[PDB]
Amino acid sequence: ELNTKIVNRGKEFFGSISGEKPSLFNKGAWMGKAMDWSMQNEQFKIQMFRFVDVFPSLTTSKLLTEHIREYFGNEQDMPAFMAVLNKVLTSNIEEMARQFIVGETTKEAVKNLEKLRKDGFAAVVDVLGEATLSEEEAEVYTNTYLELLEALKKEQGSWKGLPGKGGDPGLDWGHAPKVNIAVKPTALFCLANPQDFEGSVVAILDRMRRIFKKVMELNGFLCIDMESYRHKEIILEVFRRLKLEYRDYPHLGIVLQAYLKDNDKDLDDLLAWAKEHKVQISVRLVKGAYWDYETVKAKQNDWEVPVWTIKAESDAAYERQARKILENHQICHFACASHNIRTISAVMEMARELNVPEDRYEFQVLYGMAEPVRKGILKVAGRIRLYAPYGNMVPGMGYLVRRLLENTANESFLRQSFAEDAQIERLLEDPAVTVERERAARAARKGLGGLPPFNNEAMVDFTRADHRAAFPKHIAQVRTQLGKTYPLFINGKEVRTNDLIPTVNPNKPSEVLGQICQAGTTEVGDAIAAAKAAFPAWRDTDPRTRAEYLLKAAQAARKRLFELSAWQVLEIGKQWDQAYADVTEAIDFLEYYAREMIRLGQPQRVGHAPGELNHYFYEPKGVAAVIAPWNFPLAISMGMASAAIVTGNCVVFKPSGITSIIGWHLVELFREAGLPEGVFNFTPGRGSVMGDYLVDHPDISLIAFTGSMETGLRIIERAAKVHPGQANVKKIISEMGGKNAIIIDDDADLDEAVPHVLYSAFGFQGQKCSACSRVIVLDAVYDKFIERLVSMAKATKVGPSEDPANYMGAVADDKAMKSIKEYAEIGKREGHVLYESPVPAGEGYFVPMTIIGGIKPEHRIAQEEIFGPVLAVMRAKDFDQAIEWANSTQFALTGGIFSRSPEHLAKARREFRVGNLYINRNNTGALVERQPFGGARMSGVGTKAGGPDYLLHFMDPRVVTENTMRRGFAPIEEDDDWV
Amino acid sequence: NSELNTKIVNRGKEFFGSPSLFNKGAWMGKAMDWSMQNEQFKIQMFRFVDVFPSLTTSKLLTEHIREYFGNEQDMPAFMAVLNKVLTSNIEEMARQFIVGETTKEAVKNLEKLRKDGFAAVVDVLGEATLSEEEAEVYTNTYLELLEALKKEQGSWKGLPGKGGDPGLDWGHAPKVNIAVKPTALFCLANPQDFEGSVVAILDRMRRIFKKVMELNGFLCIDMESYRHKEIILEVFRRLKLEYRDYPHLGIVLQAYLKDNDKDLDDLLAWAKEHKVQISVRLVKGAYWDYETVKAKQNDWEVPVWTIKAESDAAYERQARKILENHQICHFACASHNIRTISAVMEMARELNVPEDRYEFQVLYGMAEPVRKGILKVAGRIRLYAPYGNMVPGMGYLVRRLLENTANESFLRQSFAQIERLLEDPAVTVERERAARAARKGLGGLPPFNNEAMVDFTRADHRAAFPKHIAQVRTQLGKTYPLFINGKEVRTNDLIPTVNPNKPSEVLGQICQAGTTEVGDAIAAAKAAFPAWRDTDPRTRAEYLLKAAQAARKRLFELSAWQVLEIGKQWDQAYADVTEAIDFLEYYAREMIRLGQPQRVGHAPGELNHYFYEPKGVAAVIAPWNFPLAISMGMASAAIVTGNCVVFKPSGITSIIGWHLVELFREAGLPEGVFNFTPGRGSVMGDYLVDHPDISLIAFTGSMETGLRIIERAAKVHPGQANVKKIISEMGGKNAIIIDDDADLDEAVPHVLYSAFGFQGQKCSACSRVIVLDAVYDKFIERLVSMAKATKVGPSEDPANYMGAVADDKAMKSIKEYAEIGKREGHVLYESPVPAGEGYFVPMTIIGGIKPEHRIAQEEIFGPVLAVMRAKDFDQAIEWANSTQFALTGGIFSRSPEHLAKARREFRVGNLYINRNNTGALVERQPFGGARMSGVGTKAGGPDYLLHFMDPRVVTENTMRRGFAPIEEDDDWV
Ligand SMILES: *[C]/[C]=[C]/N1=C2[C]=C([C])C([C])=[C]C2=N([C][C]([O])[C]([O])[C]([O])[C]OP([O])(=O)OP([O])(=O)O[C][C]2O[C](N3[C]=NC4=C3N=[C]N=C4[N])[C]([O])[C]2[O])C2=C1C(=O)[N]C(=O)[N]2
Numbered sequence A: 001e002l003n004t005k006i007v008n009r010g011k012e013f014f015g016s017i018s019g020e021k022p023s024l025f026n027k028g029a030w031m032g033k034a035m036d037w038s039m040q041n042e043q044f045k046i047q048m049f050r051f052v053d054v055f056p057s058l059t060t061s062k063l064l065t066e067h068i069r070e071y072f073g074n075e076q077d078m079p080a081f082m083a084v085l086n087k088v089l090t091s092n093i094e095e096m097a098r099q100f101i102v103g104e105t106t107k108e109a110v111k112n113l114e115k116l117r118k119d120g121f122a123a124v125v126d127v128l129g130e131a132t133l134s135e136e137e138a139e140v141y142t143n144t145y146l147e148l149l150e151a152l153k154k155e156q157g158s159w160k161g162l163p164g165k166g167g168d169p170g171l172d173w174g175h176a177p178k179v180n181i182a183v184k185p186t187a188l189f190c191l192a193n194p195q196d197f198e199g200s201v202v203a204i205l206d207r208m209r210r211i212f213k214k215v216m217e218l219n220g221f222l223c224i225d226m227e228s229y230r231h232k233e234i235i236l237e238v239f240r241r242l243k244l245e246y247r248d249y250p251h252l253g254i255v256l257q258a259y260l261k262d263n264d265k266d267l268d269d270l271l272a273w274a275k276e277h278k279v280q281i282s283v284r285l286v287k288g289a290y291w292d293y294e295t296v297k298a299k300q301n302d303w304e305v306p307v308w309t310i311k312a313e314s315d316a317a318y319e320r321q322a323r324k325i326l327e328n329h330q331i332c333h334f335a336c337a338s339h340n341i342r343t344i345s346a347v348m349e350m351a352r353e354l355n356v357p358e359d360r361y362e363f364q365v366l367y368g369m370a371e372p373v374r375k376g377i378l379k380v381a382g383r384i385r386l387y388a389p390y391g392n393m394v395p396g397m398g399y400l401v402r403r404l405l406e407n408t409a410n411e412s413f414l415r416q417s418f419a420e421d422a423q424i425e426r427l428l429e430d431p432a433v434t435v436e437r438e439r440a441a442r443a444a445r446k447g448l449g450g451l452p453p454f455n456n457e458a459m460v461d462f463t464r465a466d467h468r469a470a471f472p473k474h475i476a477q478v479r480t481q482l483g484k485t486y487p488l489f490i491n492g493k494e495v496r497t498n499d500l501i502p503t504v505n506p507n508k509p510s511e512v513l514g515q516i517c518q519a520g521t522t523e524v525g526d527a528i529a530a531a532k533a534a535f536p537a538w539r540d541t542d543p544r545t546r547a548e549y550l551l552k553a554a555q556a557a558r559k560r561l562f563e564l565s566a567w568q569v570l571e572i573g574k575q576w577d578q579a580y581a582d583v584t585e586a587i588d589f590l591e592y593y594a595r596e597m598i599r600l601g602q603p604q605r606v607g608h609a610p611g612e613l614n615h616y617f618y619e620p621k622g623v624a625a626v627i628a629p630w631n632f633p634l635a636i637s638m639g640m641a642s643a644a645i646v647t648g649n650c651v652v653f654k655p656s657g658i659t660s661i662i663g664w665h666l667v668e669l670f671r672e673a674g675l676p677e678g679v680f681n682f683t684p685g686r687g688s689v690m691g692d693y694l695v696d697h698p699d700i701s702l703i704a705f706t707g708s709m710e711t712g713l714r715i716i717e718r719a720a721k722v723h724p725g726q727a728n729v730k731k732i733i734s735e736m737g738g739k740n741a742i743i744i745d746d747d748a749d750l751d752e753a754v755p756h757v758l759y760s761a762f763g764f765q766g767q768k769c770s771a772c773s774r775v776i777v778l779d780a781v782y783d784k785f786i787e788r789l790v791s792m793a794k795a796t797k798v799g800p801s802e803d804p805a806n807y808m809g810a811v812a813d814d815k816a817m818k819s820i821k822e823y824a825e826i827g828k829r830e831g832h833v834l835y836e837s838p839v840p841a842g843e844g845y846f847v848p849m850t851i852i853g854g855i856k857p858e859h860r861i862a863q864e865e866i867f868g869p870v871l872a873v874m875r876a877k878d879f880d881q882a883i884e885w886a887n888s889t890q891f892a893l894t895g896g897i898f899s900r901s902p903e904h905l906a907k908a909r910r911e912f913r914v915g916n917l918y919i920n921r922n923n924t925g926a927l928v929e930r931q932p933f934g935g936a937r938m939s940g941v942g943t944k945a946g947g948p949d950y951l952l953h954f955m956d957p958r959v960v961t962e963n964t965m966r967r968g969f970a971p972i973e974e975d976d977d978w979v
Numbered sequence B: 001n002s003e004l005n006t007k008i009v010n011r012g013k014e015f016f017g018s019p020s021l022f023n024k025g026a027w028m029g030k031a032m033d034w035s036m037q038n039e040q041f042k043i044q045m046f047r048f049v050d051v052f053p054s055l056t057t058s059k060l061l062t063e064h065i066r067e068y069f070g071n072e073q074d075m076p077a078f079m080a081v082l083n084k085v086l087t088s089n090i091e092e093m094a095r096q097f098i099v100g101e102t103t104k105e106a107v108k109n110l111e112k113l114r115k116d117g118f119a120a121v122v123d124v125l126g127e128a129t130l131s132e133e134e135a136e137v138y139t140n141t142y143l144e145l146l147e148a149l150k151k152e153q154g155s156w157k158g159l160p161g162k163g164g165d166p167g168l169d170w171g172h173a174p175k176v177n178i179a180v181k182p183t184a185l186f187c188l189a190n191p192q193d194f195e196g197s198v199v200a201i202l203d204r205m206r207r208i209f210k211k212v213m214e215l216n217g218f219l220c221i222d223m224e225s226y227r228h229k230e231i232i233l234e235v236f237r238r239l240k241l242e243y244r245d246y247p248h249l250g251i252v253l254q255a256y257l258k259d260n261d262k263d264l265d266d267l268l269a270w271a272k273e274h275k276v277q278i279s280v281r282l283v284k285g286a287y288w289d290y291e292t293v294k295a296k297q298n299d300w301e302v303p304v305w306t307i308k309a310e311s312d313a314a315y316e317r318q319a320r321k322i323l324e325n326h327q328i329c330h331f332a333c334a335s336h337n338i339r340t341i342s343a344v345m346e347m348a349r350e351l352n353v354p355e356d357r358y359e360f361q362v363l364y365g366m367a368e369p370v371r372k373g374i375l376k377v378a379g380r381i382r383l384y385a386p387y388g389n390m391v392p393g394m395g396y397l398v399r400r401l402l403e404n405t406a407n408e409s410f411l412r413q414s415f416a417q418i419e420r421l422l423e424d425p426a427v428t429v430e431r432e433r434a435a436r437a438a439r440k441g442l443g444g445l446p447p448f449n450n451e452a453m454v455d456f457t458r459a460d461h462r463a464a465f466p467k468h469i470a471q472v473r474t475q476l477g478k479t480y481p482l483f484i485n486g487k488e489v490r491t492n493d494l495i496p497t498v499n500p501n502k503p504s505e506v507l508g509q510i511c512q513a514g515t516t517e518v519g520d521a522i523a524a525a526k527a528a529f530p531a532w533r534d535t536d537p538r539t540r541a542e543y544l545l546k547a548a549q550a551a552r553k554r555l556f557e558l559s560a561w562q563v564l565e566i567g568k569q570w571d572q573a574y575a576d577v578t579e580a581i582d583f584l585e586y587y588a589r590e591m592i593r594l595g596q597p598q599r600v601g602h603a604p605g606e607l608n609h610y611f612y613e614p615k616g617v618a619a620v621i622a623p624w625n626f627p628l629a630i631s632m633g634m635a636s637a638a639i640v641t642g643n644c645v646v647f648k649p650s651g652i653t654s655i656i657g658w659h660l661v662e663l664f665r666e667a668g669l670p671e672g673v674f675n676f677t678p679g680r681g682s683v684m685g686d687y688l689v690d691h692p693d694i695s696l697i698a699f700t701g702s703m704e705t706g707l708r709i710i711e712r713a714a715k716v717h718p719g720q721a722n723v724k725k726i727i728s729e730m731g732g733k734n735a736i737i738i739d740d741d742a743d744l745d746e747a748v749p750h751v752l753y754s755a756f757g758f759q760g761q762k763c764s765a766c767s768r769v770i771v772l773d774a775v776y777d778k779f780i781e782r783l784v785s786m787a788k789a790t791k792v793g794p795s796e797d798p799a800n801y802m803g804a805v806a807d808d809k810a811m812k813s814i815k816e817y818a819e820i821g822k823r824e825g826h827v828l829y830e831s832p833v834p835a836g837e838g839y840f841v842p843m844t845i846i847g848g849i850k851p852e853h854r855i856a857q858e859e860i861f862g863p864v865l866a867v868m869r870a871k872d873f874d875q876a877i878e879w880a881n882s883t884q885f886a887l888t889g890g891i892f893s894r895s896p897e898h899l900a901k902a903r904r905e906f907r908v909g910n911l912y913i914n915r916n917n918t919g920a921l922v923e924r925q926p927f928g929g930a931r932m933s934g935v936g937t938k939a940g941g942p943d944y945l946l947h948f949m950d951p952r953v954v955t956e957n958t959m960r961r962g963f964a965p966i967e968e969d970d971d972w973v
């Protein structure tokens, strides 16, 4: 019944449009021709849209000319509709951007808004801006709204209210405030992050409050826009708190997104909350702007995708939630925000059927698109408000790209109506019918040998209240477990020595976490003897059975995820996210290497001659020494040890002194898995006492080492000698340092480059082999890149990692703090200090977040690995010099480049020869399988952990060849070359 | 045709209207019936019968029964009770095919067969002939037999015929008829030494033939495997001409050989030319599976037809040709196939052939109804009657069982639609060919296949070596320069390279590189590197393919050089060049496979590509013992992966090293990518290894040198970009275990070859043979007796088994080791060597050796074999594992349990079961080991090229402004 009224409503709407197409679908216009070809040809769509994205950085004639050729080819190979060419492209693109923007200045915006009023349209005004990356940028954004409100304040008294059916003639349609603005919450705080939930809410709330107060001063409306899922809960809480501070002021709105599976509950909770507090609210319901982003993000982190994934589900959710809002019109004002005629028709007929007062609902569209839809709304619904952004053409271009993406999406109602000539009946169909049909249809990777395929363990997800509450609880629990003595673990038994070294909290060294027994050469010898005695039965254990112990250890760790993470926060000063990621990576190694050994464990027939069977397979070596670092104390230890173990070797394991308790987690995990005695032995000890003894020992066949170049090179040299009694040439697996650079090209997206560089340099205090310690910045973008990087750095806070508000904290120990501070002083004498953060007073191994510019390849801090929060900034005269400078060290571990030049990226792929090169993202945080990690030169020996070549380094191949012919007869085998 | 066929079909039906292994009432019938239904059981049963005569104790027998047939419960029903059940039954099955175990019994049973109307041709069962003494025993057994037959035949009444001499069989056939297996007369019969093999066999055959003629008897020369077919034909041709007036000499021809149409034509034309008479016994052929396997293993044309009806058609076609020529050629039809027999009978009638020009033969013990029928229908039937020891009687039994129960066997199919069975095989051929008419490469290239091995059954291959050796001798005396950056560079320091079998013969002079020239070569390689690294992997691979084709065209020439410069035997030389070709073909394909970047991970909004980069300059330090193969393997591997090479050949094989220069030059390899710098190790050895611009060292040679290189290269010098990657292959002290149940006819010649092939100068050579207590005396006597039959001398003469060792230095060192071993153990054999010049070390076998001894531990790299006596199989395994090396190993055993224990515990890089432990081929046997034998790299296999490269990953964030392209393999929605 209602559905039939909605369809006929939509039918009249299509009738009233008279076949008119929006400008983007007008094939008589240039933008229409461009979009037509983009919709026909996916490669051109990618070229064109990415070109419009980079366009605002093409600020010189050479940049512009080259990018045009790189994106679109030579003039002859362009489409017909496509230096003169610079002018025609520039003009058409600028014209498309102005289509969606009401002005570049406040004054121009105001004049144009008044034009729109005379044409019958209300407005909600938005300020365009690049991403806020600093406090000063947040202040500029805030002050622009204050400037806007002051201009509107002077003008609104002279505006006649838009015609209504009843109400107050001074107000739009008799009821709506004439001044309506919308603000993006994250633009008010550059470090908005649910990891610091309370801090983010407060920072945003404080600025929103200042804007709101001036909105209330002119009796205006403020809408709080909704952004990506990461900030949704923060944004809802900002709205709730501001609303309660001004419980009597009715003109405050929030956006809710119907594409979120969360939205049914979020809407219900918010209405119930409003009822409880006896307040009213306003909701602008949208479908949602970040669909592709949320799906990609969730898939990259193994989170549940937070959006519906069939487009009709979002439409059905919209009509469902709109009805809920309309039914609650008493407490909830409604803004329908959609360009979809079915959606709009649904809302109109539901409001009519529910007899909702017209002052409780209005319709909104984006300025400059769906033109015939906009005009149709005005005619049939009367009350229509245009979302009108204004400001700088740089963010204006990014906004344009997102509009073009939305208009030309395969699933777009506008594309289907105006490009594809879709049937009206199908366009106006009840989306619930659509959902069932596509759900039904959609009910129409694999693993091996009964095991699911490998997938990286889900990352900690601080959008969840339970994950946010888990860390303080588990840290507190860890604090009840302090003061213990950790013994050696040899041959399944605890062995105590009388040489104890305390392990302490680097953010609070007076806090002793425990006491670690130290192995002398006697005990190391016993560990080696136990591993050697366990080796024959372990080597003879079926590879599938050995893999099963890794799977059990992974499950044991998975059950203790937050607990194991909390130990790292305290013992080595990992931030919450850094600690959890260390534990998930350890789990990833276990799951991945288990699967790799199953794959590699089956002998393969090689060759195809009949009368003959050759089988090629692998054997372990013997006893492996595993010398692990403190910086990834569970992940890398577990990676090296489990690789050696699963391949059939037995392990003597020396954790780093300062993370010996984390090393004890390996004992716990392998013991819980029931690993046979002697296969894993835990022998922390003083390197000065037993370091060479372990490396030199005749019964060691393999050494896995991750650490400094000086130590790795020394081990490589010593391990090469063959001693009396020594059965094998020692196999060395050695990951050493990096002096990693990120290149910032002329056309880089600085909104992305700046925070990725800051995190690459200063995440975990710079204590990563992969960390960015050199940022090489192209001459023409240097001053503006540096200003933003430094201003963002200034917003960050340095302090204890157990407090999630801190960006980074103390370094590993007193020795590290002193070494790093000396490097900083050296660096300040080579270049010039750009930023040196405050650090907390009192105890703790704090090193300031430090940025030093004027650095050149000749300088020590351009060459030597500091392993701390010291970033060198280097000014390259051109891209050729940037590459040459990137390649000027003896290391080749990681590297990064931010660039949107196809030629520069191609050059970097080929010539920037690091083990792991990253394009347009941070150069840290390698994941198992996705980014197998390791390099050559002085960074290592070409082994890549977490990759499909890794396990072979811990084994040697064997071939068994059998002559199967007896008495002139051989069995035929399946793959035989025969007749 | 339809007329003749109709008569043939009708004659076939006559036979049918007119067999113990198919009798399911008897035990052998049941066992065979289950074999024909269950292939796993067939294999177990036939292999058990094969090993059975070696099961000489109660323990061996009991354990083998359980290992072959399982727990006496999971056994099929029809089968210490189980010990005696099998023993009596198997012995009974073997007796059905043998006319006696002694000459006296044979003769008496042969006389019984005569009174039953059957003629006979007598054959002497024997194990393989592995020595002159064994060849003499075999020969004298025939002489003993003939002597016994000579005294009986006058008393024999001729089988009744239609006319003629009543003192002759059927009126015309000699009453005494014997068959001899030619290779049983010479243990080293080998077409590689064609003339020597013909002469050795002919001399014994002549001795037998003279006694045959004295009795007015018939001698048939049997035909064996394809390897010896040409030798056997020539023996027949020579003996025939020596006694051109004596008509009773026959030869066997095999209709399953594609060669046979021409061989029969050739033989008939030969006989007409020489105006002699001949006799042919035409058979289908006994070695079908063997020839097919052997040809496929060596990449030779399969010499046999491979559709069974093709052999049947060939037989009828060739029988017709013989019968057309009945004037000059007597015919013996030898088939148990009723279609085949009926065809011969109607063809003989169609061509009006007199009955004294053809007869029918079957094997004693089978086709009894056929034999029953033949006698009634054809009247002239001769039984091929073997006699002798039960041991080779058992091997013969296995082969009889195999023939009877084959799917394609006329007998199995008959015991069935008669019209199908009696069909003209020509019709069957067309149908089957049509039905067949109704391994892939990659990127347009054929799949990898090992290069065809030299094939001395061919006259042209036998002629190629003396010819190419002569041509090489016209090119001696040259001075060989360095090759650096595409230019020849002369130095003043020259070292002669000489022939080790004849040191007065100087092959040329080799320029030596000083450190300055070595530095220049490294500099050239370094300068060439960037552009070579940036060359497309498919393009780099194309150069290897061009080099391989260049070598392929020079195969005999390249082989001849090795015969002279390092003393390779003909086969050893050719194999060295084919292996070089294999590496080129294989590594070219491996780089193409590895050359494409692969996406890793499946997360959307992201692309990770994983791929490989070369390292830089590689130093290649090559051995003399495989001077083209291993050199080319190491160098082409480094080159194809994008590195540039500085190559040091061994001093004494520097001319072979120069061949790498010629081959890469012919391929058009860019300058600097390959540089040739022979030099004195004391001058530039450490300089090369230590140089900071070297990123990889590929070495094959002694443990001592290899360990020194590993140690030195593990230092990183100032300006050194990388940790040096070491690819080092070092020695072996390789054992072959000879188990109680080993087949000694196989074990003996394989051990001899493994130990003394190329004078024992192989890293894979057998230098320890570990022999089980109960079979020790027996194995050692046969091994020593075979050794005694071999000759030591120049490798250019193919009559020699092995020759001089590499140089003066090697001879001295090996002789010191021989003396050490003689004090440690006891000499079992020590060959003569030629007098005069040449670096000759005797073929030396020493017994009494234990793991504690120096020659049980240290690599001698020469013709010195230690024989070690193990008390049980567990000790054999322990002793095999008692050295510091782990390169190759072998085991001769037919015990599933012992073989399984060896597969698990005999932990060498390449373990060989029931064959020699040398001769690894590319892809089939990737070669190399760990322990003190190497660093775990295997040349010629799928893990090898990665050792010359390092992986890189490029990771791209593909999302811009909220959108990322969907890629094919994305995890999506
Ligand atoms: C700053 C911001 C602002 N906002 C807004 C405001 C206004 C006034 C408006 C109008 C809007 C807005 N936004 C945006 C939105 O969201 C958009 O636009 C929408 O969504 C569009 O839609 P419509 O128009 O209704 O259309 P269509 O075509 O219908 O639809 C589309 C949609 O859907 C979805 N999807 C796709 N695909 C898919 C889906 N789902 C599921 N599945 C699948 N496959 C999406 O959503 C699209 O879009 C906004 C705002 C805020 O604040 N926030 C947000 O988020 N947004």
Ligand SMILES: C[C@@]1(S(=O)(=O)O)CC(=O)c2ccccc2C1=O
Binding pocket: A126, A289, A387, A389, A398, A399, A402, A403
């Ligand atoms: C994220 C969006 S965008 O259009 O995709 O750029 C959402 C939106 O509707 C908007 C409207 C006006 C200005 C900016 C935006 C956005 O930031």
Ligand SMILES: C[C@@]1(S(=O)(=O)O)CC(=O)c2ccccc2C1=O
Binding pocket: B123, B286, B363, B384, B386, B395, B396, B399, B400
């Ligand atoms: C090689 C053969 S065997 O039967 O296959 O063993 C050929 C043959 O038919 C034969 C007949 C009588 C005695 C011995 C043999 C063989 O050695």
